[PDB]
Amino acid sequence: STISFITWNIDGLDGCNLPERARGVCSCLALYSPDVVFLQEVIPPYCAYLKKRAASYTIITGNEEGYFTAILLKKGRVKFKSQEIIPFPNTKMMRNLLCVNVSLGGNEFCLMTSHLESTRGHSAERIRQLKTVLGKMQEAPDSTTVIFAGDTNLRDREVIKCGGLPDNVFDAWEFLGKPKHCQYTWDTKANNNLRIPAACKLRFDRIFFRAEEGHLIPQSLDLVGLEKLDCGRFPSDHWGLLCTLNVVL
Ligand SMILES: N#Cc1ccc2cc3c(=O)[nH]c(=O)nc-3n(-c3cccc(-c4nnn[nH]4)c3)c2c1
Ligand SMILES: [Mg+2]
């Protein structure tokens, strides 16, 4: 029993080299062939690109106002059961939590994604949204494997300020012993898409899981989208995260 997935803020609001960058992301999906893809900052022409160049993935969306999140399900592997949209009532950037209940490899899952409140100034709202996500993860039925993968925009001690991760929720990067090779997902030194002159390295993209003891645990975690495209830029200002969870008995 296993699940492989990619989480990626694909910077859809960047109108520069968007078809080439979308091609780049679809090439990654074809190469790594994940069961599920969690995407953030998707825009309408980006969906149209995914429909043609990643046609074997069912695109699940909630609200599609401006830019939004999506959960892609591999056709034939993942069976869609239901979707739930959890609002962030105090969001100023139309952010929300999207859960998609699915069946995969004989196991039941609630796959969640969000793009938590952006900007340093809205730290208090981002922390409240993280609490909502963590609360929803704990509320899922006991026999279901809960996976959150998204752009949290988290930094410093914001997780500590939220009250920390609960006793039954784990960060995949933390669980694997905080490996250095995938410690930053938003790196202005290694990534040139935004042309930020200052060197900034943050871990905005995070994976949280809630699984039964002795069942699914992270096997691997790797950065994706580190290959420069023909235009000399990367598919996004963010690196994507490729993760596999496996059962260890
Ligand atoms: N350009 C640029 C630029 C350069 C350097 C940094 C450095 C940090 C840092 O060491 N810690 C941190 O928590 N955030 C940093 N951001 C950041 C990243 C996203 C958003 C906002 C932000 N939004 N609104 N105001 N600031 C700041 C940067 C951004
Ligand atoms: Mg962006």
Residue numbers in the entry: 122 to 370
Authors' text:
Tyrosyl-DNA phosphodiesterase 2 (TDP2) {also known as TRAF and TNF receptor-associated gene (TTRAP) or ETS1-associated protein II (EAPII) } is a 5′-tyrosyl DNA phosphodiesterase that can remove the covalently-attached abortive complexes generated by DNA topoisomerase II (TOP2) when it is unable to complete its normal catalytic cycle. Fortunately, this type of DNA lesion is efficiently repaired, in part though the action of TDP2, which hydrolyses the phosphotyrosyl bond in a magnesium cofactor-dependent reaction, leaving ligatable 5′-phosphate moieties. Consequently, TDP2 has attracted interest as a target for small molecule inhibitors that might have utility in overcoming innate or acquired resistance to TOP2 poisons. Using a ‘humanized’ mouse TDP2 expression construct, we have now determined X-ray crystal structures of the catalytic domain of TDP2 in complex with deazaflavin inhibitors, revealing the unusual molecular interactions underpinning their mode of action.
We therefore created the expression construct m2hTDP2CAT (m2h=mouse-‘to’-human) by mutating the following mouse residues to their human equivalent: E242G, Q278R, Y321C and H323L. The m2hTDP2CAT protein retained full phosphodiesterase activity, and consistent with our prediction that the resistance of the mouse protein to deazaflavins was due to the variant M7-motif, this activity in m2hTDP2CAT was inhibited by 163. We were able to validate our approach, by determining the X-ray crystal structure of m2hTDPCAT bound to 163, at a resolution of 1.8 Å. Superposition of the low-resolution hTDP2CAT and high-resolution m2hTDP2CAT structures in complex with 163, confirms that the binding site is conserved across both proteins. However, the higher resolution data obtained with the m2hTDP2CAT surrogate, allows a far more detailed characterization of the interaction of the inhibitor with the TDP2 catalytic domain. The guanidinium head group of Arg276 (all numbering is for the mouse protein, the equivalent in human is calculated by subtraction of 10) is involved in an extensive hydrogen-bond network, including both carbonyl and nitrogen groups of the 163 pyrimido-dione ring, as well as the backbone carbonyl and side chain (via a water molecule) of Asp277. The tetrazole R1 substituent of 163, is directed towards solvent, but packs against the carbon-atoms of the Arg241 side chain, providing additional van der Waals interactions.
